[PDB]
Design a protein around this ligand. Structure first.
Ligand SMILES: CN(C)C(=O)Nc1ccc(Cl)c(Cl)c1
Ligand SMILES: CN(C)C(=O)Nc1ccc(Cl)c(Cl)c1
Lengths: 313, 314
């Protein structure tokens, strides 16, 4: 309510919500899973004070944005085309796209398929992986044992039941520092699911407060986890769309920000990205887990502003 | 509306302001008049955005999707201006160019007077800047010129509301007309019954508007009615008292005064000697242009606004 709330209808059933702060070049912030525009809480005033027009999104299936139950509505192709329509209705020819996690995956696809609409691209934790035309996306998940949670997120209604059971428990178990993390994502089920080692009433992490956790709880009461989980349920569709580009390079200015303690989106996954992205710049945050914006907000703000002032402007 | 980006800012616990947003560049805040909408800037919105400006076309307090409290005090220039400051604060805008028409034009002058640090540049269509006379009554100023008789008719709450809400399609078809098509006789609102006495039950469509454009204003005014819009007129003494607190000071920021040759209420002669109080004042004049400036001559408005923005606001 201290924020300016924007609403853009991209499709007759799809309406995208965003918070707006500041003046200057348009900066579109895209959150990950299971997040909110609120994940960019420390970045919003910092980027606006630096001289940028901040557009922090509530991604499709999250918060005040439309959440259709259809799985097909959450493929990279549909999501990217909606983001282009979002820019068109706002009268923006270009925008700087900064994404984290699943938002980071979206921003790379936006830079690859629509470079004329992306002034500059930045990604927190998520690397740019060029699709292998000879290897199946299911084979890539099963190769590394750490991605076992993704297979558990495939069947609709299964992960939804566990994540919606107790919202306060869900966010308190997920939004933790790496040394405070008790998640065993490498071996999901036996029965317990994602939160087996986590207790019924988990302790509050050093990054978040009770008020911050309760904000995500209220937001996820509106639509649940179906929409957010459907982002994982389009692995074959996204692989086929990424194969359509093949060989082409992202020529626009780019930033890759790696997190030292992110065990799922490891910094080593970002290697050789400069071969596919010639104008790639690098950022690295030590003592930083998966929840980059929450874990090290000061380091994120400094890295983003420095790059925006030199490469995006 | 469905093709537009819709923004919402809660300025007070009971007051929420709606706006349409288009383009990138310096922030340009468009403020409509009475009994209008953000839609009155329909020709200006894509034109200023294409010219390289971030357009914020307001639904003023008491109109459309914006909050409409029944209280008269909520529509005085003091409350309205403070809410616009809060609107800029929550959007993270240090400054914005303020372009107003009619009652919105009055707002932009007060915004430039009391808050010049938040106004990059000020522009007004038809509405002049008149410094309040401390030794002259506000009620006597309206009674001096016979043309402002309709304002006295707009004072009693519920009276004008009943006539304006009776038939919304008839209301907008009788008001939104060119000067040569105008059937209104606002100088004698006492002898006859209402404002639309000379107008027929089913008035003809004006050369400036289409049937679908008239239908938009009808749908918008079904939400809150005419109480909120008419309360802008019911704060004459309160607005005069606030204007007297500034007395002596000049508007030092860049300014533009756009006069309309055929506006019989906000006559171009009312804008005379404005440069004495506004040193950096620029001028614009549209011939064959009635009260509904944006509606009447859209191409002329766009050209005058773009030329002034590129030279005085940048
Ligand atoms: C494919 N991607 C980006 C993910 O699976 N990200 C992701 C998001 C949330 C969590 Cl809790 C985990 Cl372990 C990974
Ligand atoms: C004090 N002002 C600006 C007005 O009374 N403006 C105004 C608005 C609408 C109409 Cl129909 C008329 Cl006659 C005057």
């Amino acid at each position: 309510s201290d924020m300016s709330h924007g609403y853009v209808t991209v499709k007759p059933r799809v309406r995208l919500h965003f918070v707006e702060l500041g003046s200057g070049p348009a900066v579109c912030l895209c959150h990950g899973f299971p997040e909110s525009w609120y994940s960019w809480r420390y970045q919003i005033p910092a980027l606006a004070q630096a001289g940028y027009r901040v557009l922090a999104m509530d991604m499709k299936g999250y918060g005040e944005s439309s959440a259709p139950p259809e799985i097909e509505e959450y493929c990279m192709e549909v999501l990217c085309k909606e983001m282009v329509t979002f820019l068109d209705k706002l009268g923006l020819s270009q925008a700087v796209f900064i994404g984290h996690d699943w938002g980071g995956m979206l921003v790379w696809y936006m830079a690859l398929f629509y470079p004329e609409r992306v002034r500059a691209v930045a990604s927190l934790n998520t690397p740019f992986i060029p699709a292998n035309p000879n290897m199946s996306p299911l084979e890539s998940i099963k190769a590394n044992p750490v991605f076992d949670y993704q297979l558990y997120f495939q069947e609709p209604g299964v992960a939804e039941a566990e994540l919606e059971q107790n919202l306060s428990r869900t966010f308190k178990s997920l939004f933790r520092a790496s040394d405070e993390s008790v998640l065993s994502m490498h071996k999901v089920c036996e029965a317990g699911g994602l939160f087996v080692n986590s207790p019924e009433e988990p302790s509050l992490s050093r990054m978040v407060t009770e008020e911050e956790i309760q904000f995500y709880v209220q937001q996820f009461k509106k639509s649940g986890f179906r929409g957010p989980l459907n982002w994982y349920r389009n692995m074959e569709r996204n692989w086929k769309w990424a194969c359509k580009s093949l060989g082409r390079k992202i020529l626009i200015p780019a930033l890759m920000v790696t997190a030292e303690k992110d065990f799922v989106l490891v910094p080593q996954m970002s290697q050789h990205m400069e071969d596919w992205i010639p104008h790639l710049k690098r950022g690295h945050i030590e003592d930083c887990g998966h929840w980059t914006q929450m874990d090290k907000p000061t380091e994120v703000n400094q890295i983003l502003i420095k790059w925006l002032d030199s490469d995006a402007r």
